[PDB]
């Protein structure tokens, strides 16, 4: 609600970034192999920005990726809910 769905998204974005590097390392080609850009990749994902920066190529990386979308889009289908309500009320008064 308040800052609750917020926090859960950040669990997703870290645990996602972490496991993505674990899944993709060992697959000849993956660019998703350092914890920095692994984290930035999980934001593009949760937010559906699809910038085309990075993406997984292993099966298990795609699985991690799906979890981020689901758990991210849900969070972000709620984090923006919070911001929207909060700031429309504040700016309107």
């Amino acid at each position: 609600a308040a800052g609750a769905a917020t926090v859960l998204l950040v669990i997703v974005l870290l645990a996602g970034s972490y496991l993505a590097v674990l899944a993709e390392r060992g697959a000849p080609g993956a660019q998703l192999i350092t914890y920095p850009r692994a984290l930035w990749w999980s934001v593009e994902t949760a937010t559906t920005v699809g910038y085309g920066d990075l993406y997984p190529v292993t099966l298990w990386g795609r699985l991690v990726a799906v979890v981020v979308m689901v758990a991210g889009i849900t969070s972000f289908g709620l984090v923006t809910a919070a911001l929207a309500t909060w700031f429309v009320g504040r700016e309107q008064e």
Partner: antibody, heavy 117, light 108 residues
Framework: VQLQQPGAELVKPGASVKLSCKAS????????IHWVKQRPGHGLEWIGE????????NYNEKIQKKATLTADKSSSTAFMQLSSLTSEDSAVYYC???????????WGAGTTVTVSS | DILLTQSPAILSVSPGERVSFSCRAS??????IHWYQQRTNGSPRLLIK???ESISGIPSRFSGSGSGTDFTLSINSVESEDIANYYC?????????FGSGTKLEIKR
């Protein structure tokens, strides 16, 4: 001395050998340990990486995959097992400390391996 | 497997002068190159990370240049303590790879 590995080894041809790397300093969850091979008069040959905490390892596709990586989580020491060697396999063997960001900040002293009877 | 290609192999130079080892990738890797120095008998030693950023404890002589598939280690001046092999190593795509290496010789 951050990454600390033995001085020299001798292996009968066809025998196996284990290689150590004790790492004082930090011991981060996210640390990776790599192993690079330097044949005499050559360049650096990335062999394989291991993340000690979580436990998975990945080896170099291209080379004859003679080795296998392990670690001891509560001793801060990591291992590489080279199985059944020739004299093509005589070289210096470093371990490196990649933080997870893609470069080998910390290097071991290297272990000289000489495969001979 | 990405191919790093350091030309030239050897690099003659007179002391105090600028010097530049080219490294040329086999496809774009952005800025994910890193440079290493390895003198005679000693282990390698990180010089420049991420193609430009410096390392705390490295002489300011070393200057990281380049991006894409053309990269350049530069030493703004040269002195005798700089003779070594110099290696590059990409982190853009798995596996991490190394270059063939360049040795630096000094005409004196």
């Amino acid at each position: 001395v951050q990454l600390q590995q033995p001085g020299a080894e001798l292996v009968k041809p066809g025998a196996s050998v284990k290689l150590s790397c004790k790492a004082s300093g930090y011991t981060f969850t996210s640390d990776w340990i790599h192993w690079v091979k330097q044949r005499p008069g050559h360049g650096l040959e990335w062999i394989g990486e291991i993340i000690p905490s979580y436990g998975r390892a990945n080896y170099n596709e291209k080379i004859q995959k003679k080795a296998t990586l392990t670690a001891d989580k509560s001793s801060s020491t990591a291992f590489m097992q080279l199985s059944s060697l020739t004299s093509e396999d005589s070289a210096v063997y470093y371990c490196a400390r990649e933080r997870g960001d893609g470069y080998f900040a910390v290097w071991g002293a290297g272990t000289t391996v000489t495969v001979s009877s | 497997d990405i191919l790093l290609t350091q030309s030239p192999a050897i690099l003659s130079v007179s002391p105090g002068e600028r010097v530049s080892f080219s490294c040329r990738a086999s496809q774009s890797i952005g800025t994910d190159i890193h440079w290493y120095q390895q003198r005679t008998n000693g282990s390698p030693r990180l010089l420049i990370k991420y193609a430009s950023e410096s390392i705390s404890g490295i002489p300011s002589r070393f200057s990281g240049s380049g991006s894409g598939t053309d990269f350049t280690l530069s030493i703004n001046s040269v002195e005798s303590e700089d003779i070594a092999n110099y290696y590059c190593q990409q982190s853009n795509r798995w596996p991490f790879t190394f270059g063939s290496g360049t040795k630096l010789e000094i005409k004196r």
